[PDB]
Structure 1
Amino acid sequence: TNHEQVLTDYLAAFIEELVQAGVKEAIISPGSRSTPLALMMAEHPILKIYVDVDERSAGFFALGLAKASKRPVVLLCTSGTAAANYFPAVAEANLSQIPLIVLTADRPHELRNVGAPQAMDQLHLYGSHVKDFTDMALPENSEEMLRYAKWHGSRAVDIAMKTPRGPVHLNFPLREPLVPILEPSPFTATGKKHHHVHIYYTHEVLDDSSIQKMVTECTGKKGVFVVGPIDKKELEQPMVDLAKKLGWPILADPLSGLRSYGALDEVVIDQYDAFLKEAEILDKLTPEVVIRFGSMPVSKPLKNWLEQLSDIRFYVVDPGAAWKDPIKAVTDMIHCDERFLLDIMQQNMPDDAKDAAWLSRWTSYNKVAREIVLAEMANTTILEEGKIVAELRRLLPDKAGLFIGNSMPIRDVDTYFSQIDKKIKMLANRGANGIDGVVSSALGASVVFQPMFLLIGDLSFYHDMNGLLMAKKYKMNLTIVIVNNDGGGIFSFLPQANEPKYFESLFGTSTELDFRFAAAFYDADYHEAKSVDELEEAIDKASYHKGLDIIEVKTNRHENKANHQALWAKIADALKALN
């Protein structure tokens, strides 16, 4: 009894502090060693629990939920290889700056590295892929240890939510017996117990000298904004307003939110991946200033171009000093909040240093290429990869969420998803660009945004098929469009597709999986879209179905390259003739 009471007081002070620090959800995996942490978080009247038996799927589920809500999400698993399954989501959360509080149970010291069953060295388990690691003490209920448990609870959340955000790992060695005292409840009916650690909201700010320096050096310059994947509060309207004020184009990634923030503007460029391939056009586009926001864009033609830009002022806005610059072209590094920098320029830059011909050159190429793409997709009935993205852009409701898988789906959105006057929250795992856990990440984001849709390739869908168990047992609403080209279509473009001897076994891995059976395994409505009218009917059915939908579109891998190169050629020819 004394042992169980110590175990209860120790974890109650830690769990209550997680809730008071802003944790609302906890994704738990079943286990015997994690029993005291799992039971008490379920007993907590505010913490919402999601139980996932696949630890790999559970990690990405919590990852998507945190990525969509900007909220710190708790993960719990038992000792052993269950904690090793968190590594893909932890590495992705570290490179994408997602606040995951990873709690892993462990054997006590007497059962560590002694060959005990379900025992594993978990000290610094994730290496440098967490912002901080803590090996908690064995449960003690003394005054200093109860305040030590609350201290680490507030510290874990604060370090995870501190810019640059990222995952934190806490290891809990737990000694048997493992059943705490839940009656009476350890969170409620405990008077004179509140001792919350309030954390104040802070943000980084440029000096007055730094502000004057950049305002002076950016006035009257032919500048270009490059906004890659970035998910901060708002920021979509302030970026457009500053670009209108300066007359600068915004090379906007699909994941920047600028292609679908609810309105149309004349500064967002969404065809750069297309026309930056043309050499005869880059002459008139050479800028003097480049100001980067967020991560690096998916566009590889946007890369290379920025890589060869010589004798320019290349600003990079990096609030956390993460130093994400894969081209190493940075000339001026800025470590301040993006919202602050946008406002501080909005009311300091001159209101009339706008070379109209500069923005006219970018918007001309962009709007001409934009309509050639929309023309080729409107006049086709073959449901090619680009057509799937085009019809999604047309059929998605306002205030809808769209999770985009890596590989071809994210690159096809960059090519075939122009700016539209609807609010579409777009997410993707762009830390390591892994095809793993995409289904769970979308399901976690479906807790926040509704209606939620997922554009994903076939290989990636198989990878995290287990995620769908969360959709089945929690009655979740998600519409999954599978671009089943039966293998890896990303490898038809890369130069390995010309050697046919070992292709289709090392790269284009054919699966021949009938996803209709997988849709039945997870209680999902299945539709095979063979025509444009069928794909429509399926999407319209998915809105009237509050549940899991799967819309498979079989495409041809060996025809993608020709379709994309035919479109890119028609764009280059038209833009070459422009004066």
Structure 2
Amino acid sequence: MNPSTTQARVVVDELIRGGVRDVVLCPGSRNAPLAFALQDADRSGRIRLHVRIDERTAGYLAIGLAIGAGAPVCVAMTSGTAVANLGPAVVEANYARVPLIVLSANRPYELLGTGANQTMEQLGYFGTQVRASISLGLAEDAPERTSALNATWRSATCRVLAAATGARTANAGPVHFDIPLREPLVPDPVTPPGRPAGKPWTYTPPVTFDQPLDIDLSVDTVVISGHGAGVHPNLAALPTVAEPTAPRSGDNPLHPLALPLLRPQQVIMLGRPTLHRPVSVLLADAEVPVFALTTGPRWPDVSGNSQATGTRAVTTGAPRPAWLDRCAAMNRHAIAAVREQLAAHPLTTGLHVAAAVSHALRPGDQLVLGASNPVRDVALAGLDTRGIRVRSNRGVAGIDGTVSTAIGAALAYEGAHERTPDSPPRTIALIGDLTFVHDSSGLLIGPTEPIPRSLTIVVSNDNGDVSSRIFGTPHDVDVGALCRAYHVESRQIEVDELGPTLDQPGMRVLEVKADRSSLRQLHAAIKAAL
């Protein structure tokens, strides 16, 4: 067995032993040792392989596969710009804390500078965005040292996995794992074994990261939970303004529109609040003390008056019953204003589409939102997220790869369900037309590749500085033709067919035509009803 083949199979085996169940693969000659090894691991059921053409959107497919089931996901590609194309997904994975392993092939470092074709400054390309950039090193031709090389290769692989999952740091994130490979790259015309019982070479258990923080709940308190927030049972009774991706620890919801009309004496901040301007405006009021509770070492700088950080609260006291009544009444008032104006508005807007999707969902659903207006609109409509997994690329809230993220979240979620009978759970994506068109090529799944069992992509189509001149005109891109180009079933429907159509039992796109013209008066009328 030649060295490139041997090294690639040890690495793939250790990655599977480390809990990698899905791998995204992109084509190239230099990464042939990785592709062959990943191929026959897929053939023997060890992993699910996903081949894509476009490295950039492929990274967001890997992200989707990671957030959909919570497991580390590798994306493998060849040397050169194929590695650079992972930049966008790496930036998002860094801020969203996603265990994304960029498993790049390379030519031997000894050829960098020689002018060799398709060779670049690959190691360190991502700089500070990854948790680590680890090079495996060139596989030596030395049979007598096969047991030594097997130990170093496997140990390096667990380092990559641990950095990516935050096994010891509590801060998952992208890792660059660069594999210099040289010919022969294809199997020549047994692989060094790992630990017994399928154990990882270096076992590191998930650490428990604890920083208790004393907080008095008697002071009038509002909880604001953003992306990456944890669950806090002792904060469940408090009024909570929760982003759609934040897990609702309790059942005392507070609409984001209600918060500006309330006067909290202190704020408990869960995770990283990324979305609401009213949230930011209260946090930028330096005079209300903010307590930062996070699941990892990072904590948000959004308030300048963050008195303290921690992982959990040690609560004394109890919220004033009058305070709870007031906020609860303001929450119902805010959500009544939204629903009544929506019903009085004559035209279907993106908020109507968003409200319609939120009503269609049921516990067990997975909802994927494009990171601009859809996550805002769903939040405005007052989506009750208890019992449903909401996913969104809120690390940088970029537009790239949204379709691919939804396809990946569906696949990992469904596959988690077929490791337990009943019909696979529903994944419903809500993305706007510009984002859909922008990552429309993320729809492309090869005829030989896994197709989501139950993904429905709802496109809320409202047909849309001198750089902003390109929004001065509707693009008028034919959504149906786009889905035809990537052979995906599509149907243009109306907002009240949405509920029934979603209840109609593989992967499909439902396009709902929406008006953007009157959106200002819809929102103005909602501000007035408060």
Q: Is the 8 A contact 2:443 2:488 kept in 1?
A: no
Q: Which amino acid aligns with 2:220?
A: K
Match of 1:222 in 2: 220
1:16–1:187 CA contact under 8 A, matched in 2: no
- Contact 1:529–1:551 (CA<8 Å) still a contact in 2? yes
Separation (CA, whole Å) in 1 of partners of 2:91 and 2:380: 28
Which residue identity does 1:85 align to in structure 2?
N
Aligned counterpart, 1:198: 203
* Higher alpha-carbon Rg: 1
User: Hey, what does 1:576 align to over in structure 2?
Assistant: none
| Equivalent in the alignment of 1:252 | 242
TM superposition shift of 1:389? 1.3
Q: Which amino acid aligns with 1:155?
A: R
Alpha-carbon distance change, 371 to 418 in structure 1, aligned in 2, over 3 angstroms: farther
Task: Render the CA deviation track for 1:372-393: whole Å, top value 9, x for unaligned.
Answer: 3223335656322111111112
Paired AA for residue 11 in structure 1: A
CA contact (8 A) 1:131 1:159 kept: yes
Q: Could you tell me which residue of structure 1 aligns to residue 316 of structure 2?
A: 349
1:37 to 6, 22, 34: 34
Query: Which residue number corresponds to residue 94 of structure 1?
Result: 94
1:223–1:194 Cα change, 3 Å: closer
1:302 is the counterpart of 2:309:
no
Change (3 A) 1:202 1:557: same
Aligned to 2:463: 486
Q: Write the letter of the residue equivalent to 2:284.
A: E
Give the whole-Å Cα distance in 2 for the aligned partners of 1:250 and 1:410: 17
**2:516 equivalent to 1:519:** no
Please give the root-mean-square deviation of Cα atoms over the aligned residues, in Å: 2.6
Native 8 Å contact 2:280 2:302 kept in 1? no
User: Which among 323, 329, 332 is matched to residue 305 of structure 2?
Assistant: 329
**TM-score (normalised: structure 2):** 0.89
Find the counterpart in structure 1 of residue 404 from structure 2: 440
Judging changes above 3 Å, is the alpha-carbon distance between structure 1 residues 381 and 9 closer, same or farther for their aligned structure 2 residues? Answer: same
CA offsets 1:64-96 (integer angstroms, 9 cap, x no match) = 111121100011000111111111000100011
Q: Quick one: which amino acid aligns to residue 535 of structure 1? A: L
Q: Return closer, same or farther for 1:540/1:378 CA change in 2, 3 Å cut-off.
A: farther
Aligned to 1:457: 432
> How far did residue 12 of structure 1 move?
2.6
- Partner in structure 1 of residue 148 of structure 2: 144
Aligned partner of residue 69 in structure 1, secondary structure: coil
Relative to structure 1, is the Cα distance of residues 508 and 65 closer, same or farther in structure 2, using a 3 angstrom cutoff?
Answer: farther
Post-superposition Cα deviations, 1:243-279, rounded to whole Å, max 9, x if no partner, equal 32xxx31121111132xx8xx83x221x22x2345xx
Q: Distance in 1 between matches of 2:523 and 2:133?
A: 46
State whether structure 2 residue 14 is matched by structure 1 residue 7.
no
Task: Tell me, yes or no, if structure 1 residue 157 matches structure 2 residue 133.
Answer: no
Q: Partners of 1:193 and 1:295 in 2: how far apart? A: 37
Match of 1:493 in 2: none
CA 1:369–1:7 in 2, change beyond 3 Å: closer, same or farther? same
**Equivalent position to 1:360, from 300, 325, 329:** 325
Query: Which of the residues 467, 478, 490 maps onto 2:442?
Result: 467
Matching residue of 1:275: 258
Cα contact 2:195–2:201 (8 A) shared by 1: no
Corresponding position: 1:243 with 2:236: yes
Tell me the residue number matched to 2:416.
Answer: none
More helix by share: 1
The answer as to whether partners of 2:26 and 2:77 remain within 8 angstroms in 1 is yes
Moved more, 150-159 or 133-142: 133-142
Aligned-partner Cα distance in 2 for 1:503–1:432: 20
Q: CA deviation at 1:109?
A: 2.9
Question: Deviation of residue 297 (structure 1)?
Answer: 3.7
Per the TM alignment, residue 26 of structure 1 is displaced from its structure 2 partner at its CA by 1.0
> 1:443, 1:471 within 8 Å by CA — same for their partners in 2?
no
Distance 1:569 1:196, change over 3 A: same
Amino acid across the alignment from 2:12: I
Determine which of 5, 17, 22 is the counterpart of 1:20. 17
**1:51 counterpart residue number:** 51
Matching residue within 183, 188, 196 for 1:176: 183
Amino acid at match of 1:555: A
Give, in whole Å, the separation in 1 of the partners of 2:220 and 2:75: 47
How far does residue 7 in structure 1 lie from its aligned partner after superposition? 2.6
- CA displacement 1:325-355 (0-9 Å, x = unmatched): 2333311122x3xxxx26xx3xx635xx331
Deviations, residues 278-333 of structure 1 (Å, cap 9, x unaligned): xxx34xx131x2111111141011111221140x4311123332232233331112
Distance 2:195 2:98 in 1: 33
Unaligned runs of 5+ in 2: 414-424
Q: Is the 8 A contact 1:67 1:445 kept in 2?
A: yes
TM-score by length of structure 1 reads 0.82
Residues 275 and 103 of structure 1: CA distance in aligned 2, closer, same or farther (over 3 Å): same
Deviation readout 1:435-485 (Å, 9 max, x if unpaired): 110000011000133311111111111111111112864332321111111
Amino acid at match of 1:268: P
Answer yes or no: is the 8 Å Cα contact 1:479–1:551 preserved in 2: yes
Equivalent positions of 1:76-115 (< 5 A) are 76-115=76-115
Give 1:94's aligned amino acid: N
Q: Tell me the alpha carbon deviations over residues 99-128 of structure 1, each in whole angstroms, 9 at most, x when there is no partner.
A: 111111111134322222222220201111
Report the counterpart of residue 292 of structure 1 in structure 2: 269
